[PDB]
Structure 1
Amino acid sequence: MADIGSNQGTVNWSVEDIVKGINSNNLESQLQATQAARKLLSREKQPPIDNIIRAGLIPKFVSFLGKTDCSPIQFESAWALTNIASGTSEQTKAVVDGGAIPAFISLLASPHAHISEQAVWALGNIAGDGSAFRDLVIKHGAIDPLLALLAVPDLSTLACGYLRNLTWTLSNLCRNKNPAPPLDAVEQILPTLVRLLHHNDPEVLADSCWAISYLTDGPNERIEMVVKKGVVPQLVKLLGATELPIVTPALRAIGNIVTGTDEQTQKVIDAGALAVFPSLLTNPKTNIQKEATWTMSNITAGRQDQIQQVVNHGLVPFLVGVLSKADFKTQKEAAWAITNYTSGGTVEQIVYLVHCGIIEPLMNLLSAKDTKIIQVILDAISNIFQAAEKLGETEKLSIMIEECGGLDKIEALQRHENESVYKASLNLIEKYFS
């Protein structure tokens, strides 16, 4: 979707000159002026977006989008408008206010690939502004034409840059949450999205995953319409991809899905997702590690038979590892994973947790400046003592917590300031210790 010049004299034009040319009654002079404008808006640094808007050029550019007889000016103005729309919400608004949406949607059917591609790009920028413009683009009927552009036997016959553009614009139509995209628009888009999720290009796969992650971020009903399409196995596969740009959105999508129902969570387990976590929980990239632990916490919050799966895959030692050493935010997710595990696990599963060495690292964290994680941890111990109570082992556990220095940190918290904390402590103290 890219261009040139007439460019000895279309480079570095002044805005007054551009206005002069566009105001001439000459289509060719307007074309030259529009290209000059595009070049100012397309330069490497500080494009004069506001100056162009103030000159009142948008309405002219929009009208040039409809000049089928001069494809070059359609393309140049489409590019100019695209770059104005790439700015602030206010700059994107000016483009919308000029009536650009229906004009760009009309250009989607252009016989010229580079022109329909620019139209796609522009709509991506407009929809990317947020919920309102996203939904306005949809109301103008952008989805059908966009989907038609991908209606081919094999995606591979499409120009690579062209396909990446369509995928990205489609993902923005699935983006944002207050409100989320119209249910029927999501249903209309899903089938094509599933197809892109199986394409071989790394950027198309990444953005496809991001779109899926957007769609799974919300009520269980939204998660269900995605899981229903049977994409989980594919998401699990991409979860093991070598490229971080693909793994990140794949893990996010998987993580959103396990925040749903036990039935929906069971789907990721059935697909074999847990076998990838030994690697995800030790990933060099700290964000992956964080999201992986976060995902584990929503799985340990599941059924006992699901917690057992976590056990069978040998993931408890990995949780003990993250709890012992990791970026603090990851350690916080681990604490949650542990408290959720102890909250719904069987006595045997909880005993196992202690046998893996969860106690010491858990106590060492009680010394963190984060009342939230502290509550979570004290809460975890309570659940663990309760398991040892049903075993008349409440004493062997007290020693352990005393051995590693736990008590010397719980009593100190007993004198905390947050009622939730000092109360929780005191209770544990007088109930299990001295």
Structure 2
Amino acid sequence: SLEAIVQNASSDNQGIQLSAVQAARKLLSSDRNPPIDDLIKSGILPILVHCLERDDNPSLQFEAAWALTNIASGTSEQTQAVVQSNAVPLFLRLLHSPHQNVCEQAVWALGNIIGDGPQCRDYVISLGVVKPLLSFISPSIPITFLRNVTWVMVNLCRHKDPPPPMETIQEILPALCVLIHHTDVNILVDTVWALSYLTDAGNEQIQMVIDSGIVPHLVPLLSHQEVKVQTAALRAVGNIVTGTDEQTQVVLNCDALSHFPALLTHPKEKINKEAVWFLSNITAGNQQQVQAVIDANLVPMIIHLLDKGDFGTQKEAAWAISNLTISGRKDQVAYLIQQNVIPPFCNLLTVKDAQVVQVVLDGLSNILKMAEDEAETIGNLIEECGGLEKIEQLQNHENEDIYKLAYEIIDQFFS
């Protein structure tokens, strides 16, 4: 009797209330076809939200929290019905309940709400969720509960186009510093993905992450046995090394490069690609960082991937080679030449990704300009592998930066 349940829940007698709220909860969480929509149309939601305030009856508070949780675990329309009934401030309140089960049910409901979309997430942040959420992280916490805590932290951290507030980041980072030493794979995945979302927000957030002290704990996860950890960590440090040279050097000082031979040869193409992206951000640095890439014996592996990798990896390797020519010294570029970069580099001149074509022409141009006396030898190598015919054809490309640079190269070195 759904009507009866609604009427009884509104009674002043708290035991009849408990019976009714328990009945609604049992209708919702006990079957594989719950009547969620029917309970919403009944008008029960504001009653349950009122029940969440009853600290003097924790069984009633628990049951109402569980009912609303299960409604919020449903479809987007069901979660939004919960949000529109003003449930959120009451769940944030229940994060400070002394009763663990009410706290766990509040975390779960808030997770579903935050997951519905960006404005609900930003509402929950604006109401102060982070401090009480992170307060749960302790040595005695059950792992299932901690997993739900960390999932909510990731989801608070993930929609980036709204940058989360800086002060929230200051609250979240100490928790990540704690969690990065956890052994549970799901906790590590969530912690590191959260870090990678923070590190994608800009150089100032990168600096906050650096200043937290977490990078020497983060870098070694590049060699974790679990691939999900490896790929989260590779994203996080790659984003750090999109920052300044000094921020990149923070990563290098952790011996990051020692992890890369096993990433360039990893069976997963996605790890090869992400690793070469990382390296391309190292070679865009100063002469010493270029030399760090050379001295780690990584250049032959990059050139191999430039030649035989999947296109996404090939594009990243093209960037890594061309970026090396930005600040690299003549002898470092000469080392590239000795390692037979030219044929596979020139083989990318014919692809449909115009950005890659431009990158390759930029690198070839830089190489030719840098070889004071050997420019003729290098021009001959470019000719031998068909690079010259390809450059000649690029004079007719639609894109002005390409055809201009092809003309300039042809005028300076093959005329």
Length-normalised TM-score, structure 2: 0.91
Q: Could you tell me which residue of structure 2 aligns to residue 334 of structure 1?
A: 317
* Bigger mean CA offset, 30-39 vs 210-219: 30-39
Q: Which of 28, 38, 43 pairs up with 2:29?
A: 38
Q: Which amino acid aligns with 2:52?
A: L
Aligned pairs (5 A) from 1:10-409: 17-24=1-8, 25=11, 26-27=16-17, 28-39=19-30, 43=32, 53-68=40-55, 71=58, 74-86=61-73, 91-150=78-137, 152=138, 155=139, 157-388=140-371, 390=372, 392-409=373-390
- The alpha-carbon deviation at position 176 of structure 1 amounts to 2.2
* 3-state DSSP of counterpart to 1:361: helix
- Distance 1:76-1:411 versus aligned 2 partners, 3 A rule: farther
- Distance 1:387-1:168 versus aligned 2 partners, 3 A rule: same
Native 8 Å contact 2:72 2:79 kept in 1: yes
Q: Which amino acid aligns with 1:63?
A: H
Native 8 Å contact 1:23 1:30 kept in 2: no
* 3-state DSSP of counterpart to 2:158: coil
- Distance 1:333-1:82 versus aligned 2 partners, 3 A rule: farther
- Distance 1:48-1:251 versus aligned 2 partners, 3 A rule: farther
- The alpha-carbon deviation at position 288 of structure 1 amounts to 1.9
- Distance 1:162-1:393 versus aligned 2 partners, 3 A rule: same
Native 8 Å contact 2:88 2:110 kept in 1: yes
CA distance in 2, matches of 1:335, 1:262: 20
CA distance in 2, matches of 1:20, 1:406: 82
Length-normalised TM-score, structure 1: 0.87
Q: Which amino acid aligns with 2:146?
A: L
* Bigger mean CA offset, 81-90 vs 294-303: 81-90
Gaps of 5+ in 2: none
* 3-state DSSP of counterpart to 2:260: helix
* 3-state DSSP of counterpart to 1:174: helix
- Distance 1:338-1:88 versus aligned 2 partners, 3 A rule: farther
Q: Which amino acid aligns with 1:263?
A: E
- The alpha-carbon deviation at position 130 of structure 1 amounts to 4.7
CA distance in 2, matches of 1:158, 1:319: 45
- The alpha-carbon deviation at position 301 of structure 1 amounts to 0.8
Native 8 Å contact 2:21 2:64 kept in 1: no
- Distance 1:429-1:61 versus aligned 2 partners, 3 A rule: same
* Bigger mean CA offset, 53-62 vs 246-255: 53-62
CA distance in 2, matches of 1:51, 1:393: 81
CA offsets, 1:101-120, max 9 Å, x none? 12112222334323211211
Native 8 Å contact 1:301 1:340 kept in 2: yes
- The alpha-carbon deviation at position 18 of structure 1 amounts to 3.7
CA offsets, 1:342-377, max 9 Å, x none? 111111111111111111111111121111111111
- The alpha-carbon deviation at position 135 of structure 1 amounts to 3.4
Native 8 Å contact 2:28 2:35 kept in 1: no
* Bigger mean CA offset, 31-40 vs 360-369: 31-40
> How much identity, in percent, do the aligned residues show?
51
CA distance in 1, matches of 2:236, 2:216: 12
Q: Could you tell me which residue of structure 2 aligns to residue 14 of structure 1?
A: none
CA offsets, 1:233-291, max 9 Å, x none? 11111111010111111111101101111111001100011111111122222222222
* Bigger mean CA offset, 97-106 vs 136-145: 136-145
- Distance 1:418-1:208 versus aligned 2 partners, 3 A rule: same
CA distance in 2, matches of 1:194, 1:167: 13
CA distance in 2, matches of 1:431, 1:320: 26
Native 8 Å contact 1:335 1:376 kept in 2: yes
Gaps of 5+ in 1: 1-16
- The alpha-carbon deviation at position 129 of structure 1 amounts to 4.1
* Bigger mean CA offset, 308-317 vs 49-58: 49-58
Native 8 Å contact 2:306 2:344 kept in 1: yes
